[PDB]
Amino acid sequence: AYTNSFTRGVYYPDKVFRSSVLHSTQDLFLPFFSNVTWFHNPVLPFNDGVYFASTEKSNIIRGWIFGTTLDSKTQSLLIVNNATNVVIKVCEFQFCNDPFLSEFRVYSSANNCTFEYVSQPFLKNLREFVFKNIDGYFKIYSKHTPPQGFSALEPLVDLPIGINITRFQTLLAAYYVGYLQPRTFLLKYNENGTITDAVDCALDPLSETKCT
Amino acid sequence: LKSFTVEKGIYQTSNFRVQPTESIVRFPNITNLCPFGEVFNATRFASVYAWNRKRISNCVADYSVLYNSASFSTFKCYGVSPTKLNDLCFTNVYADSFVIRGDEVRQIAPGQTGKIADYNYKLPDDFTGCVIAWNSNNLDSYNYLYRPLQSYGFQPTVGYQPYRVVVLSFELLHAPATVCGPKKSTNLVKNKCVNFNFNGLTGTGVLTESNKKFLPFQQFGRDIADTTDAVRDPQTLEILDITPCSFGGV
Numbered sequence A: 001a002y003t004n005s006f007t008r009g010v011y012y013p014d015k016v017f018r019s020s021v022l023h024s025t026q027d028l029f030l031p032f033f034s035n036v037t038w039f040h041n042p043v044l045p046f047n048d049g050v051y052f053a054s055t056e057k058s059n060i061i062r063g064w065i066f067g068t069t070l071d072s073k074t075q076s077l078l079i080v081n082n083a084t085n086v087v088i089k090v091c092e093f094q095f096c097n098d099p100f101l102s103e104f105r106v107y108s109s110a111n112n113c114t115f116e117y118v119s120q121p122f123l124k125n126l127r128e129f130v131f132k133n134i135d136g137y138f139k140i141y142s143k144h145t146p147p148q149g150f151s152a153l154e155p156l157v158d159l160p161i162g163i164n165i166t167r168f169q170t171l172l173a174a175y176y177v178g179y180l181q182p183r184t185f186l187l188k189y190n191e192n193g194t195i196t197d198a199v200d201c202a203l204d205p206l207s208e209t210k211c212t
Numbered sequence B: 001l002k003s004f005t006v007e008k009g010i011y012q013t014s015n016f017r018v019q020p021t022e023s024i025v026r027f028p029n030i031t032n033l034c035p036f037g038e039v040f041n042a043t044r045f046a047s048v049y050a051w052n053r054k055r056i057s058n059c060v061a062d063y064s065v066l067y068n069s070a071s072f073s074t075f076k077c078y079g080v081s082p083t084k085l086n087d088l089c090f091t092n093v094y095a096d097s098f099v100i101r102g103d104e105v106r107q108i109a110p111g112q113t114g115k116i117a118d119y120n121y122k123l124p125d126d127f128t129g130c131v132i133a134w135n136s137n138n139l140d141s142y143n144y145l146y147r148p149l150q151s152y153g154f155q156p157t158v159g160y161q162p163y164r165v166v167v168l169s170f171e172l173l174h175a176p177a178t179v180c181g182p183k184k185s186t187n188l189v190k191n192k193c194v195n196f197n198f199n200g201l202t203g204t205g206v207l208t209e210s211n212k213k214f215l216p217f218q219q220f221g222r223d224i225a226d227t228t229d230a231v232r233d234p235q236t237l238e239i240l241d242i243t244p245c246s247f248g249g250v
């Protein structure tokens, strides 16, 4: 089952304030009107930056797993959002065939942990996410909103893990998964410095002209 | 004009430029400290036959306190002076903690021989970090053995007294740097042409209060044509405007 990624998925690329200006930038963005896969979890590739989104009312989705082999041979990222204390770890975890957590199973044999991080809690409400791995910096952009329409994405954390991440899996009824691509946009900055509109410069010749 | 006679007119000869009066350096505020609070800071040391190796990462390491501390009997560093570590950065640091005798303190060195260096903790011939040693007679003077295994005759009554030894081994290429010294901050001065350094962003100009509502995540603002027009202050989160300090032709 596929759905259209209407125009969602635009984020501030550089943590730099600008106002009342049109800025053209190149980064891994989700191209406009691309196909987004809809799932109802199996292991999925992570190739170069993955756009996530879910709508629930009871925080049913509770965590992620990131890694390369998921067989304790390498350090693997583990995110387990608790009720009030979200936990991020990087350990040589052994992952279950179908890890799930209200009883948990994925966090057994926690040995040779190389990174631990604790933060503020996350999660009729659509909760999106963006994950990118750049030069050992793992970057998460997020925003929860009350998929048609436009909304910009602010960053949350930047974890200097430096681990080679290739696949992922989600911990648990339905969710969306897109893939980023190295496409250039034109970003419109409001007087308050918030991105209001954008133009996919390779979408169509009119947008090519607008960017030019 | 390269002449001794100047005809009537207006000529441009030089340029006026105000110079900065002082430099202001500011950086992200002090955060979690490296848990140096736990090894010599500790209650009991493991024996040298089963010395401990603790990893320390993702923290700021102030070597000034330990270097100024006079409680260390020996402090031998290789490579860089102990006062420059506040500038240097590393990927990881490991602490090798054990108890030995003073006569055995000579064994902690590259390319050394002896019972310890041959049957026990042996240092590599390559780059070493820093070794710290002190006499621990008061606290540790048959519970301690050395690797076939023999016990020390630690009698509470100079080379046979217990010495506790910690070796600081530095990993400097394994990953992006996460353990570094601090960054001493300075007071900020406004309405003067100053030479500033905000969280790694450099330049000169005059700093004034600004009414630009930045977003909580951006750190510095930049006007059209890629010029820094404002930055936000660390340690006050205030948003301060930058204006080039006056110049022009003469």
Ligand SMILES: *[C@@H]1O[C@H](CO)[C@@H](O[C@@H]2O[C@H](CO)[C@@H](O)[C@H](O)[C@H]2NC(C)=O)[C@H](O)[C@H]1NC(C)=O
Pocket: B029, B030, B234, B235, B236
């Ligand atoms: C960084 O640390 C300094 C102090 O170490 C903080 O400055 C304080 O700011 C509050 C304002 O809410 C003042 O009431 C205090 O008097 C300030 N302390 C000093 C010593 O001047 C600053 O807020 C910290 N900033 C961050 C981001 O942690």
Ligand SMILES: *[C@@H]1O[C@H](CO)[C@@H](O)[C@H](O)[C@H]1NC(C)=O
Pocket: A080, A082, A083, A084, A085, A087
């Ligand atoms: C939530 O779970 C984490 C580990 O999954 C734990 O460290 C934390 O203490 C928990 N918070 C509670 C029980 O409030």
Ligand SMILES: *[C@@H]1O[C@H](CO)[C@@H](O)[C@H](O)[C@H]1NC(C)=O
Pocket: A112, A114
């Ligand atoms: C544990 O992780 C470290 C970090 O990379 C690695 O060097 C080591 O080989 C791993 N295994 C053991 C037994 O230390």
Ligand SMILES: *[C@@H]1O[C@H](CO)[C@@H](O)[C@H](O)[C@H]1NC(C)=O
Pocket: A190, A191, A192
């Ligand atoms: C910018 O923000 C201020 C305060 O939030 C608001 O009054 C103003 O209308 C905003 N500018 C816009 C929406 O163009």
